[PDB]
């Protein structure tokens, strides 16, 4: 089952984060999670269409819903893709209106190095669900379905759109990142695997991997 956070900066929830892109009186929204002193970890397919402008993209951390942000506002600065065929992006965004780095606002996030996963292992997928009200947070307990290359699927746990949102293990420590997944199937994520960790460390130098 999905359950709101509402305790949204609180331990490994701090980092979750609400990515919004206006476009014609719509919008895109997904999520990502903190990750380095001035990135997030999402999908390329969330910041694609601001590929020429990244300024276009706010991010929230801990966003509880439409009318309270937390920890504010932080705007897309460069989007660093990963050059492999996974839906996987670094967007590293400005310092906020006090200066202050959102690496600095939130603790980021822990990355497993995925020496014990495993299918049938328990995780979480935690971010902002498409069919649920603007910027609110929600968790979904799951099962791990299939591993493989950059790969991590993942049973019929989450719906309604979750592109970005962080996967976790039980030491809430990332394991992949949720792009997509085979309607009526599998859900998928972006496996954070030794050939992901290596761009992570190649671009994040404060990278937490644990």
Not at 18 to 24: E, R
Not at 54 to 67: F, G, L, T
Not at 84 to 99: M, Y
């Amino acid at each position: 089952n999905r359950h709101q956070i509402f305790n949204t900066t609180q331990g490994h929830y701090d980092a979750v984060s609400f990515i919004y892109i206006p476009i014609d009186g719509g919008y895109m929204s997904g999520s990502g999670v903190v990750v380095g002193e001035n990135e997030i970890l999402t999908n390329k397919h969330v910041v694609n269409g601001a590929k020429g402008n990244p300024r276009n993209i706010s991010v929230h951390p801990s966003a509880k819903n439409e009318n309270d942000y937390p920890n504010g506002k932080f705007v897309g600065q460069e989007i660093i893709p990963y050059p492999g065929n996974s839906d996987l992006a670094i967007l590293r965004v400005s310092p906020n209106e006090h200066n202050q780095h959102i690496g600095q606002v939130v603790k980021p996030a822990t990355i497993s190095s995925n020496t014990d996963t495993r299918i049938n292992e328990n995780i979480t997928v935690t971010g902002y669900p498409g069919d649920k009200p603007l910027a609110t947070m929600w968790e979904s307990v799951g099962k791990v379905v299939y591993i493989g290359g950059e790969e991590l699927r993942y049973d019929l746990s989450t719906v309604g759109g979750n592109a970005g949102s962080p996967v976790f293990n039980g030491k809430n420590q990332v394991i992949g990142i949720h792009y997509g997944g085979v309607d009526n199937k599998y859900n998928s994520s972006v496996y954070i695997n030794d050939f992901v960790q290596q761009f992570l460390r190649n671009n994040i130098p404060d990278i937490n991997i644990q």
